[PDB]
Design a binder for this molecule. Sequence first.
Ligand SMILES: OC[C@H]1O[C@@H](O[C@H]2[C@H](O)[C@@H](O)[C@H](O)O[C@@H]2CO)[C@H](O)[C@@H](O)[C@@H]1O
Ligand SMILES: OC[C@H]1O[C@@H](O)[C@H](O)[C@@H](O)[C@@H]1O
Ligand SMILES: [Mg+2]
Ligand SMILES: [Mg+2]
Length: 374
Amino acid sequence: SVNPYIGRSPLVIKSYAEKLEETIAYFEAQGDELNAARTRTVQGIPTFAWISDSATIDTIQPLIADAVAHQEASGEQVLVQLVIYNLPDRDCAAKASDGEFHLDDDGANKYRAYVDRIVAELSTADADKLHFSIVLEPDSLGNMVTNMHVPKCQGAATAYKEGIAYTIASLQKPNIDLYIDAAHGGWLGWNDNLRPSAEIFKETLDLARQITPNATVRGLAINVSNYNPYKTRAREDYTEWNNAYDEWNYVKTLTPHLQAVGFPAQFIVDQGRSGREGIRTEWGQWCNIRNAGFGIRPTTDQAIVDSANVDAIVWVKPGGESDGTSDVNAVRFDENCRSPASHVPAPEAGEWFNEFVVNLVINANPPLEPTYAA
Ligand SMILES: OC[C@H]1O[C@@H](O[C@H]2[C@H](O)[C@@H](O)[C@H](O)O[C@@H]2CO)[C@H](O)[C@@H](O)[C@@H]1O
Ligand SMILES: OC[C@H]1O[C@@H](O)[C@H](O)[C@@H](O)[C@@H]1O
Ligand SMILES: [Mg+2]
Ligand SMILES: [Mg+2]
């Protein structure tokens, strides 16, 4: 197994880049050409494409066709980055989940068929020309470590392991690298959470190997949709007694446990919203955190990454797509989205939050280099 990111060009998601035209127009109207140009830079930064429901499977083949055309035109080794996010009884510790599959409505079998539909799209002649990096199931297995007092999590534990195992077993190809989601330092980095986390990742991989005999994964994805810095400048008070107080330290502290159980210790790390620290009063604040900045841009450069266990810094959650609505009356209202640290008003989850992106640009660290036309 080799670092699939080296020499590869992660795919710019066209549908995401187009959304940033609104942000460019805002800055232009402010007479702010530097930030308009920084936003153009952001348009050229690769992000992950999320497959968070069955309908979104329809976007995969057009994405692939575009990717192949780009590979032909550019001569790059295109690396398509995807998130698979649709377990049955998804998000078991949340008051509400938008996940479309439910265990009491044939959800386990429906999830397998959803995976099978993804497999078909990733098995075309065009798909074979590309390489894929796929994050498996954010907000899943950490619940088995810390949320087993929750009835829905108790009832979903076996299904989460079996579901992810099927996804792993179904996506063994030379041109696909898989990263199991492993939450973030503030969730699983606490001393007593490290070993059970490593064990559950290994347990899930072992289940996968009972389906497809020599099945492997590349490793883990961390900080997905969160804000934790890679290397903290000013270590925050809420991290007290947690040795995973930034994501680089999460890697360093989790790695020995992975090694002990025989699970691959290679990581990709989301930094898309990690540029600004001191934006939260509690580690568990996650929804549209105000003044978040774009973080370290996607890179494999070891001068920045500074760990043999880290394949790449990546941008998984696409900045500007809302984490949830702030409207108390909304059918999908989540009270976390009115936390004292949240940016309000915020639109429905997934909808474009332009004011938030304006701030992501302004608060980026390192500052964004502008892209000016020739
Ligand atoms: O990390 C983003 C993810 O967080 C979920 O809440 C976590 C939280 O991140 C962690 O700090 C705390 O210890 O545990 C909770 C889960 O119990 C949140 O529920 C998700 O919506 C969000 O995507
Ligand atoms: O913004 C990226 C993704 O975030 C997830 O938390 C949401 O459930 C998806 O609807 C969205 O596509
Ligand atoms: Mg529903
Ligand atoms: Mg709008």
